Symmetry: C2
Subunit: 483 residues, 2 copies
């Protein structure tokens, strides 16, 4: 199925995602939208029976979601329901009510499945292979233990923002009564880990709060790293704030009644799991349901050296991948020939190779400032499987091709673990020289290094490359000659 | 599908690869150059082509052939200009090229060269009438355009490299070159308030003016220059030393030719009584292509066709259904609300294009999709649009469902830009149009009852109703569904 729509009927909101499959492993999120139905509204005081008005709202919203799915020419519609519907004595009635109204066939999924799908997404679409997911929802909280890309255990707890809200916070009971309740369920988590994968809207909201609190330069939620110990106190503080204080931190109006109880869950879980680093995730159950279908024969895992966002990016903007692969190859050969001089850690080949593939991607938009554009595409769309540093490095190499990288760059200094300015100049220089030598259809290039002289061997004239040699920015005094 | 054009100029050899994405849709896929300068030292020998510049030219064009093939060109159009057409050994140099790489150079005369420039400026600029100024290495072409149709063609024998090696390399008084250029410019039989600057010299000078004023948009095409106001500065360029030119941003390879070129421009501008010069990023190369693409259309695009807008949609909006609906509702809401915002009907032009392209950037990422859209618009919506057009459309898309900041740089890029309250109105209308078009609902009808917009429809419009609070209204305004 080329175009696949995924509908997620949660306890707090109703969400829709349209996925487009560009190649075997290539895909990208084509369209997203939401509705704040909150089908669980007022149900926790009546044994989880879905009330009449929320069901009417859910039907009206799900009917237009079906319309949206069809105008995108969807070949497959996967619809799932979670905690609030799971627990509802009248779940069958609501499922059949939706089918009669718009045709959608809701598939109620158990709390373990809900946890599994989240783990599948994080294990394939994040830049770390080991850790525990934390998917705080309206009615339940899921956790999936992941070790080296494989899911080793799963837990589902019956604590949730709207559940805690309607049980304790709307009755204005002391928070310690709501805190105790959550701890009693969190104790049922049989694992610990230094890493955490933050999943769900509540955590995306708290992630935005911190991104604002630290003036983060990169405006991408997926991959955002959060020191758990340093911010644990700040997260608990959010619980006791009034509505006006939450607005000043950036919390949307529609999250004001739920984020307080949400922060409380997250703070109790972070303490129990002994987390020290939480990575914000932008994917969850929705993406998991899709990946479970996409990677049916590959054990729900991507083959090694297969990144979905890198591939789909080339599928969308580089259908003719021939030129970009030669540039990448020459980047490796030069990196090796020059290794005695630059002594750069081999780990940056990863970033240099990708920069070579994508250096000219931006030409699809304009040949002028093309590298600027490619750097723009990279920083904003190269998400799955890359850290924010990985984007920054890859971004800068392409951006400053044939140019000198300034010393006051905001992105280059986003962290102390970033490579030196000399390393970036070295890498970008290599990229630049490679682009010049691949301008023609030259083959069998060989490079040799002497004390300080790079010698380029080839049977071709390489007239243009030779003419363009002055306009390269060298990292150090260096001589370049053509045999 | 893919057409390459090779321009054998007097100062440089140029290669451009064009991709045709539809009937009228095209975009420049790749470009490069070589500084062969085949005319080096030719003006002393009545135009004879020297050996070294010919061997360099052969080597370069042979690799321009290699490039054209690896881009899968079905057509390779090659033209030669002044320096090559004035030589006594033209036929021989053309033979060595065809021998060495298989290219068939077509020598074109001055009239033909002015035409190709006029064809490009007549189709790819945001003004319909004016005079082109194509200052090259050995000639200066001028075409008269009236309502997009070419009326007269003239070719002058003044050029950068020419004026350089005849006057400026010999360290004589500048007034001698000005007199020579004046006597040759007098041949121009027309005048006009609009001039279209073409060629690398003028692009280099425009780049200098942009830096001087700290311009916020980094696109050359469509840059407007006040001729009277900037004439004196252009004249001063002539008397500057190279180190002074470097601080102005002039690259090394233009240092030897920008002074003579500046002098030519100051005389042409003065003689044509030019009031507005529009920098053109397109020239002879684009004319050759448009001549082949618009062969059955009298070398001009229909007066409803923008090849930039189109190509931008061919590249990123193959399925055009949703966008056309949003545009339609943008017009209806605009007219229905006119008693409240009282905005000049000329701004419908922008709101409609913003409505077509508001969601374009979703092909890069659904997150921050509207910003991506603005980025595309501001950097690639070039042919047939002014910079203000770009700026306005860019801002409408960018700040959908948002409040436009008061200190926005693009909003203040000019004093003629619309007010912030106007931009807020258009952005708000776009936003409402987007919500009402989310589903496939039809037959929307609007009525205004003293600040009350009433949206009439038979469909539930559930989602549109729920999203209403997230709109940023430009003024206190009531909106209700019937
Ligand atoms: N799943 C997911 N969502 C993302 C990601 N990045 C951003 N979003 C969400 O998409 C919506 C758009 O936020 P922006 O990207 O800043 O675009 P916008 O503000 O101009 O509307 C927001 O949801 P919202 O309107 O604040 O409501 P909510 O969905 O956050 O509860 C935002 O939190 C991501 O990586 N993954
Ligand atoms: N024909 C045309 N050219 C444009 C246009 N816009 C920019 N250019 C030229 O393209 C080349 C790329 O310079 P930039 O656009 O700044 O991109 P870059 O700095 O990263 O190389 C420059 O030519 P250059 O390297 O300075 O040498 P030259 O070709 O200008 O003489 C620039 O003047 C345009 O609209 N039309
Ligand atoms: Mg959920």
């Amino acid at each position: 199925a080329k175009i696949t729509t995924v509908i997620d009927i949660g306890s707090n909101s109703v969400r829709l995602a349209v996925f487009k499959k560009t190649s075997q492993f290539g895909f990208y999120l084509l369209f997203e939208t939401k509705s704040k139905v909150r089908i669980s509204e007022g149900c926790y005081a009546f044994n989880g029976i879905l009330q009449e008005i929320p069901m009417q709202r859910a039907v009206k919203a799900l009917s237009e979601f079906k319309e949206i799915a069809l105008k995108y020419k969807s070949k497959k519609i996967l619809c799932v329901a979670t905690s609030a519907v799971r627990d509802a004595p009248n779940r069958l009635e609501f499922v059949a009510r939706v089918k009669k109204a718009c045709g959608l066939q809701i598939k109620i999924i158990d709390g373990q499945k809900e946890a599994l799908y989240g783990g599948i997404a994080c294990a394939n679409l994040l830049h770390k292979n080991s850790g525990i997911t934390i998917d705080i929802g309206g009615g339940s909280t899921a956790c999936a233990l992941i070790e080296k890309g494989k899911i080793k255990d799963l837990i589902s707890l019956d604590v949730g923002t709207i559940r805690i809200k309607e049980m304790f916070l709307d009755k204005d009971l002391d928070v310690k009564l709501a805190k105790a309740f959550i701890q009693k369920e969190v104790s049922k988590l049989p694992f610990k880990h230094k890493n955490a994968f933050g999943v769900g809207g509540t955590i995306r909201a708290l992630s935005k709060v911190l991104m604002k609190r630290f003036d983060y330069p990169i405006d991408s939620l997926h991959g955002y790293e959060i020191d758990a110990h340093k911010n644990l106190a700040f997260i608990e503080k959010i619980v006791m704030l009034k509505e006006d204080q939450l607005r000043l931190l950036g919390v949307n109006e529609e999250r004001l009644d739920s984020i307080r109880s949400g922060a409380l869950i997250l703070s109790v879980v972070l303490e129990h799991l002994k987390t020290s680093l939480m990575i914000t995730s932008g994917v969850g159950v929705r993406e998991g349901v899709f990946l479970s279908d996409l990677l049916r024969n590959h054990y729900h895992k991507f083959p090694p050296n297969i990144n979905p966002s890198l591939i789909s990016l080339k599928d969308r903007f580089l259908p003719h991948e021939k030129h970009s692969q030669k540039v990448k190859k020459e980047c490796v050969k030069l990196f090796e020939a020059l290794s005695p001089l630059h002594k750069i850690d081999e780990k940056y080949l990863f970033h240099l190779k990708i920069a070579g593939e994508l250096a000219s991607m931006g030409k699809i938009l304009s040949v002028y400032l093309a590298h600027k554009h490619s750097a723009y595409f990279i920083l904003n769309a190269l998400s799955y499987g890359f850290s924010h540093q990985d984007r920054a490095i890859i971004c800068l190499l392409a951006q400053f091709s044939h140019k000198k990288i300034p010393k006051d760059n905001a992105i280059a200094h986003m962290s102390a673990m970033m490579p030196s300015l000399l390393t970036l100049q070295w890498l970008s220089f290599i990229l630049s020289l490679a682009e010049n030598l691949c301008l023609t259809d030259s083959h069998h290039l060989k490079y040799t290094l002497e004390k300080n002289k790079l010698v380029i061997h080839s049977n071709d004239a390489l007239y243009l490359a030779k003419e363009m040699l002055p306009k390269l920015v060298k990292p150090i005094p260096l001589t370049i000659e053509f045999a």
